[PDB]
Amino acid sequence: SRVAKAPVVVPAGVDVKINGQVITIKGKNGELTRTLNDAVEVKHADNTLTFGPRDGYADGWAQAGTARALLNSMVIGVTEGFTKKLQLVGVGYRAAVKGNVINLSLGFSHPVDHQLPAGITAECPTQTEIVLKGADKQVIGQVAADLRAYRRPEPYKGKGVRYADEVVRTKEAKKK
Amino acid sequence: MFTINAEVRKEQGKGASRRLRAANKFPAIIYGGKEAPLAIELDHDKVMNMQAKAEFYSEVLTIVVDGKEIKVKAQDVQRHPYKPKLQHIDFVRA
Amino acid sequence: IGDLSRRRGMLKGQESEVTGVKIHAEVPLSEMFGYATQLRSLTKGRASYTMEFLKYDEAPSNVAQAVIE
Amino acid sequence: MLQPKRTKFRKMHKGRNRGLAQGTDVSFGSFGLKAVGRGRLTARQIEAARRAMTRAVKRQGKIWIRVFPDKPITEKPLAVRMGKGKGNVEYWVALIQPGKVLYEMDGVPEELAREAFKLAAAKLPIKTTFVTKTVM
Amino acid sequence: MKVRASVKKLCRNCKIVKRDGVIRVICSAEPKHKQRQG
Amino acid sequence: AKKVQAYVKLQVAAGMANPSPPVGPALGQQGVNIMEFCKAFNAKTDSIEKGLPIPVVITVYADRSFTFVTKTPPAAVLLKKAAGIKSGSGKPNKDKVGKISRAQLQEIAQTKAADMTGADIEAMTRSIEGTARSMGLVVED
RNA sequence: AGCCAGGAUGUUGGCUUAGAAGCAGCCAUCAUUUAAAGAAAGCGUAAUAGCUCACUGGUCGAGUCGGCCUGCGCGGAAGA
């Protein structure tokens, strides 16, 4: 529980409305809300944010550490946002952005016309590349995984929607 | 150079001894001399932790009882069959 | 070279030229069977070879015990 | 497998298997396999247990077997009604009591001794433990 | 995946975790080492 | 002098300036042309005699110019002929041939000094008398 | 325990040198210093390079690692 004790710093331009157990973050990139667990205590500071395993259940040290890094994920979300780069490796793969939907040509005999959730924007500077932009690490984490869910990389040449920071675990083709 | 904490046990017997070893303590006996023997009870945990050394069996063991500390030698160890504990030790008063 | 090891390839070494990496080795005749069918299966059809005779060298224990009918 | 050469009788009464055991200390080598459960060991499991741990060290050190089958356990043949006489002896067992020193060995390093006994124990129907020779 | 009633940590990177109450072993390097139910 | 992308730490024969199939896999990995490299090799090759093995380090610059800082006999290959025989091992503790002194090797440590400057004159000899210990040889003075 | 600098390797060490360069494994098990360094486990590999591992030289700043004896629970556990 080193991360349960470690306070979340709130730098300038960021507003934290500690209203009971539902906490709303607010900053440079909008505003998000998140309800916390009742095993977790909350106090602001002079400027930072310190949380505690509130009395009652004794497993709050396990709980507040989860409750800490969530807000530590949220405080960076409304200051910089986050972004997952992708690679659409494979000949015959493109993707374009029509406002909020993505038209993925994945070698299927039906167009993959996938629509994103709200609060995120996509960027396709290269047709085999996808730059998702959003606030939460959670919401863009799933979207990148749902994009991988259409064509997961096969371990022979890695044809798929692999991450640009992930190395694919290709094996030997080993036969004819 | 080992030291043993112990005391005199009373009301001995079969079930009496079985009542002891289910309470983290076990009996013993000290004999040898022109006197009467001494049925001495001593802590189980402490002496079992120190019986691993060879100096537990090659030294004048310094058992203290009611203030009076005596130097004895370890004759035999009647230990538990399959559990790693032990049941009884014979201390000849050397 | 690694697949040549499975074909008992007594290697010599690795040499290079202007666009090719030439490697000469000794291979048993018993494991010559369909070699270029397995060669260009591993080299994308861009390789070649030529078989020449050297000697009736030693047949090991597993290879000596096989053909005895 | 181990079997008594020239015993007195052909069959023997069943008999309960109570009490404790006599072989308790690691009396010959340094590392033994004391038994914690209470059952019986036929000769086939006796032969198989040594075999697995003999090849665990492959030759190394002396290995002593402290249990020998004495009880001639019989079985009746199938489709035969009860009675009609005691059945013929099929296999020989050694009744195991709690705190019995089974297989014992010497001349091997400790860590592989516990390893070799671990390979042997899974062939046994009795829960055992790895015990070490103490002084006296 | 191997539904083996015993599970052994077969490598260095093989980690043992309890998912949904069931003990599961996964590996970062070798996907042949995945197993459960132990 | 670039850190790892092309540096090769091996060679055997000075007089045999041709890289035989034993040596060739290292040159073919990056494409080192030995023929004009032999002319640069033979400037220092002629300074030493043949019969004592020589290694090389290889440095390739960014502009396809490739050079080297070659050697003289280092640690293993000089102590072998110092014993008289190039080999005779596979059994360090199980064989015992010859007895060599360190004062005579203190002179050849200075010949290794201008070649492969291995630390602490006698402790480098103590690193290779361990090799003499591992070649089955014995050393006593 | 991580993060950056690392991998303190003489030794392309025999050998079988076609290579077994710490890593084919038999062996010596030498030594440099011995503030961070075994003449070596491991996939990877023709063989080096390799990323590491043993180990943290500086960063942070508190407790921590694995067995033993056991109380109570889980999985093992599929029938008309």
Residue C10 neighbours by CB distance under 10 Å: 12
Distances from the Cα of B25 to the Cα of B5, B30, B48, F61, angstroms:
11, 16, 11, 80
Helix (H) or strand (E) holding F100: strand F97-100
Annotated domain spans of chain A: 8-80, 86-162
Instruction: Annotate D33-86 with DSSP letters as a single string.
Output: EEE-S--EEEHHHHHHHHHHHHHHHTT-S-EE------EEEE-PPTT--S-SSP
Q: CB contacts < 8 Å between B and D, how many? A: 19
With 0-12 / 13-18 / 19 or more C-beta atoms within 10 angstroms meaning exposed / middle / buried, residue D123 is middle
Q: Strand, helix or coil at F131? A: helix
Determination approach: cryo-EM
Q: How far apart are CA B13 and CA B3, in angstroms?
A: 27
Is the separation of the CB atoms in B74 and B90 below 8 Å? Answer: yes
* C15/F28 Cβ within 8 A: yes
F and B adjacent (3 or more CB pairs under 8 angstroms)? no
- Is the CATH number 1.10.10.250 carried by domain F72-141? yes
Strands E35-36 and E2-3: parallel
Q: C-alpha dihedral over A17, A20, A22, A25, to 10 degrees?
A: 20
Closest CA in chain D for residue B77? D136
Partners of F96 in beta bridges: none
Are the C-beta atoms of D93 and D23 separated by less than 8 Å?
no
Considering the domain F1-71 in this protein, what is its CATH number?
3.30.1550.10
How many whole angstroms separate alpha carbon B42 and alpha carbon B44? 6
Sorted by sequence, the CB contacts under 8 Å of residue D100 that are 6+ apart come out as: D21, D22, D23, D24, D34, D35, D66, D67
Closest-CA distance of chain D to residue B82, Å: 4
Assess C13–F contact: CB distance below 8 Å, yes or no: yes
Q: Which chains touch D (3 or more CB pairs under 8 A)?
A: B
State the Cα torsion C42-C44-C46-C47 to the nearest 10°: 10
Pairing of strands B86-92, B25-31: parallel
A86-162 has CATH 3.90.930.12 classification: yes
Chain B residues within an 8 Å CB radius of D35: 82
In the numeric block, the tokens 């004819």 are attached to A176
Of D36, D134, D136, the CB nearest to B82: D36
* Resolution in Å, one decimal place: 3.2
**Neighboring chains of B (3 or more beta-carbon pairs < 8 A):** D
Using a 7 Å CB cutoff, list residues 26-55 of F near strand G: 26, 29, 53-55
Domain ranges, ordered by start, for chain F = 1-71, 72-141
Residues E15, E23: Cα–Cα separation, whole Å: 11
* Contact call for residues D3 and D92 (beta carbons, < 8 A): yes
Q: Which helix (H) or strand (E) holds B78?
A: strand B68-79
What is the identity of the amino acid at A140? I
Q: Cβ distance F31 to F74 under 8 Å? A: no
Q: How far is CA C39 from the centre of its chain?
A: 10
Task: Identify the DSSP state of C60.
Answer: P
Topology of domain A8-80, CATH: Outer Surface Protein A; domain 3 (3.90.930)
Q: Which CATH class is domain B1-94?
A: mainly beta
Q: Report all structural domains of chain D as residue ranges with CATH numbers, in order of start.
A: 21-136 (3.90.1170.10)
Domain boundaries, chain B: 1-94
Rounded to the nearest angstrom, the minimum Cα separation between D37 and chain B is 9
Task: Quote the tokens at residue A125.
Answer: 């500077």
